[PDB]
UniProtKB/Swiss-Prot annotation, chain A:
Family the entry assigns: Belongs to the eukaryotic ATPase B chain family.
Gene that this sequence comes from: ATP4
Subcellular location: Mitochondrion; Mitochondrion inner membrane
Protein name: ATP synthase subunit 4, mitochondrial
Residues of the full protein shown: 88 to 139 of 244
Note: Present with 12900 molecules/cell in log phase SD medium.
Free-text function comment from the UniProt entry: Mitochondrial membrane ATP synthase (F(1)F(0) ATP synthase or Complex V) produces ATP from ADP in the presence of a proton gradient across the membrane which is generated by electron transport complexes of the respiratory chain. F-type ATPases consist of two structural domains, F(1) - containing the extramembraneous catalytic core, and F(0) - containing the membrane proton channel, linked together by a central stalk and a peripheral stalk. During catalysis, ATP synthesis in the catalytic domain of F(1) is coupled via a rotary mechanism of the central stalk subunits to proton translocation.
Recorded superkingdom: Eukaryota
Curated annotation (Swiss-Prot), chain B:
Cellular component GO terms held in the UniProt record: mitochondrial inner membrane; mitochondrion; proton-transporting ATP synthase complex
Name used for this protein in its record: ATP synthase subunit f, mitochondrial
Subunit (UniProt): F-type ATPases have 2 components, CF(1) - the catalytic core - and CF(0) - the membrane proton channel. In yeast, the dimeric form of ATP synthase consists of 17 polypeptides: alpha, beta, gamma, delta, epsilon, 4 (B), 5 (OSCP), 6 (A), 8, 9 (C), d, E (Tim11), f, g, h, i/j and k.
More about this protein: Present with 14600 molecules/cell in log phase SD medium.
Disulfide bonds: none
Chief place of localization: mitochondrion
Swiss-Prot/TrEMBL keywords: ATP synthesis, CF(0), Hydrogen ion transport, Ion transport, Membrane, Mitochondrion, Mitochondrion inner membrane, Transit peptide, Transport
Function in brief: Mitochondrial membrane ATP synthase (F(1)F(0) ATP synthase or Complex V) produces ATP from ADP in the presence of a proton gradient across the membrane which is generated by electron transport complexes of the respiratory chain. F-type ATPases consist of two structural domains, F(1) - containing the extramembraneous catalytic core and F(0) - containing the membrane proton channel, linked together by a central stalk and a peripheral stalk. During catalysis, ATP synthesis in the catalytic domain of F(1) is coupled via a rotary mechanism of the central stalk subunits to proton translocation.
Cellular localization per UniProt: Mitochondrion; Mitochondrion inner membrane
One GO term of the biological process aspect: proton motive force-driven ATP synthesis
Family under the similarity heading: Belongs to the ATPase F chain family.
Amino acid sequence: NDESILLLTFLGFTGLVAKYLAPAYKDFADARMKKVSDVLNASRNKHVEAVK
Amino acid sequence: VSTLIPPKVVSSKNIGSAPNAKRIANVVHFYKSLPQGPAPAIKANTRLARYKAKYFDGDNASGKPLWHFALGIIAFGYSMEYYFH
């Protein structure tokens, strides 16, 4: 009935929630672990040449 | 008056220098560190182990679990809002 249509509409909205047209938070997170990983490359190596 | 001898006095000089403080630090930081990703414990087995390997791991980390939560409410139509308040 009317109730079933409302759930279907939000599932379509939830489907649109799935896209966000390439969501920023996806790339906002994507920028993070690379930033997190890269500094550990620099920081750990920073004391590597300390003994070198 | 004679031949001075400061070429060989590092046996007791290698303690006060600043790099030695870092030297004794990072060498302890190195020996026990796992070599090549060993002991990562990738096989998680605790209650809902299947969930721990599909979405709870964090590889996806999306709105599927809340979608599963929402669908659980939908499947409970005639249990909470119908036949009850």
